[PDB]
Symmetry: C2
């Protein structure tokens, strides 16, 4: 049997670990896994979906929640072709989806910093128009309140999550009359950029500033060019892969199976970017 | 004919090969071919399974990366069958196969020439596993570069490693604790280079001031973010050119079974970062 996976492109994201895990679990169910890259060209993505639904595969797996793919996913769902999505937050559809609890991940990150004695905790957001980023910001806000901390507009830097977003965000935060003793970043890329800008301003990390990120990106590269390894929320990529294969196999053995949504919690990786405060 | 080119990888990882994969898709498109990738998850029997899947009819041709001696018999088997096969960075000695390679030797020569041009006379090398041709080619280029620049070879400036995690940190500790420390070091890869910069910092040294570092892969290219202010001066691999050449050899091979195996080589290019500075 063959399960097909279409990606927008090959890149060093957390999905690289997900890809290897799909092969591990598919092999356990005696299935082959085949991947295609669309080179971020939606025409090609549609071409690869047709290749798979046309007979090259028994099932298709897609990643993310990009609005441009709304029509395409709906198009695939009109058919009964087995489909499993990963981290998808489309409102109007009923489809097999394996998601991550981004909200509780942000809550646990802030709880962890509060447990270390931090009371001035900032957040550098992702693109809030995307559900994952909105959930991480909402989790941060809920955790401030649950821990009896005040919310401050100056401690939240809204970004589009692009490259250098961490540098400028850390610059605004550290130039405040009263700087966060700790920052929770939407992702590890921003976290590392925060550490870089801080050191440029003469601040030392974790001593002058504690940082907690998201994705545990060091695990992908196996090294980071920075003086510390980020404390970060780890995505359950192995559990996500197992669940996705299981949903697909079941969906393949019977077309009368209804769309199941399975959610998994993130786990905190303890790095060297955090320090206890008096 | 399926109009499909199959690629079998040992695993999905954050290496320079990530850029090669996207370029394979880009060039295949121009030749009206779909590209499909498989990961063996490092299971050799899994790799065999994927090769059988492709040669069994799922694809019209196959691409494999690297030069692992484990796969020598597999490659010979694929070659006995007339199936369209193109290898990338393969250094197997007894076969006639389409092969697209990178000039690792001259890349190392160009790296060392640059450090000599900056005034460095004490240049160390942290190697990769020398059992692999690429690591040995990078080591040999460094040696030849020392000789062409009228510098003496010093065994103490060559640290042999298997190129694994933390290999750069340990190598840097040995080199910097020498009676007379290298004023510059050429690492087998960027990962070792970044590890060298970090360990040097822990010993109270400042990079490029106390130590110039030149790596290989220009790995920063796959970082969609900025980790540090010290970016490695490093050799860039011609992955766009390699992918195009691989697909041109593959399409010709699928079209004509009697096309003879060709070996095409591409030079690396020096990327100037912020990890080097002038000596005296």
């Amino acid at each position: 049997g063959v399960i097909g996976v279409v990606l927008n492109e090959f890149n060093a994201s957390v999905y690289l670990k997900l890809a290897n895990y799909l092969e591990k679990f598919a092999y356990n169910y005696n299935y082959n896994v085949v991947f295609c890259s669309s080179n971020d060209n939606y025409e090609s993505k549609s071409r690869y979906v047709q290749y798979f639904t046309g007979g090259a595969a028994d099932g298709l797996i897609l990643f993310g929640s990009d609005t441009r793919d709304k029509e395409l996913v709906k198009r695939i769902l009109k058919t009964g072709f087995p489909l499993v999505l990963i981290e998808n937050y489309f409102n109007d559809i009923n489809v097999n989806d394996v998601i991550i609890n981004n909200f509780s991940g942000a809550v646990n990150a802030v709880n962890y910093l509060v447990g270390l004695g931090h009371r001035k905790i900032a957040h550098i957001t992702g693109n809030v128009n995307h559900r994952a980023a909105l959930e991480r910001l909402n989790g941060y806000i809920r955790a401030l309140n649950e821990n009896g901390l005040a919310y401050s507009k100056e401690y939240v830097i809204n970004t589009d999550s692009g490259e250098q977003s961490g540098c400028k965000a850390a610059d605004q935060l550290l130039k405040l009359k009263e700087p966060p003793t700790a920052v929770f970043t939407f992702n590890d890329m921003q976290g590392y950029e925060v550490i870089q800008r801080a050191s440029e301003l003469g601040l030392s990390v974790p001593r002058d500033l504690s940082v907690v990120g998201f994705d545990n990106i060091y695990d992908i590269f196996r090294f980071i060019p920075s003086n510390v390894r980020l404390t970060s929320m780890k995505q359950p990529m192995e559990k996500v892969a197992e669940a996705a294969i299981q949903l697909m196999v079941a969906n393949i053995d019977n077309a009368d199976e209804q769309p199941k949504v399975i959610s998994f919690e993130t786990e905190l990786f303890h790095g060297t970017s955090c320090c206890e405060r008096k």
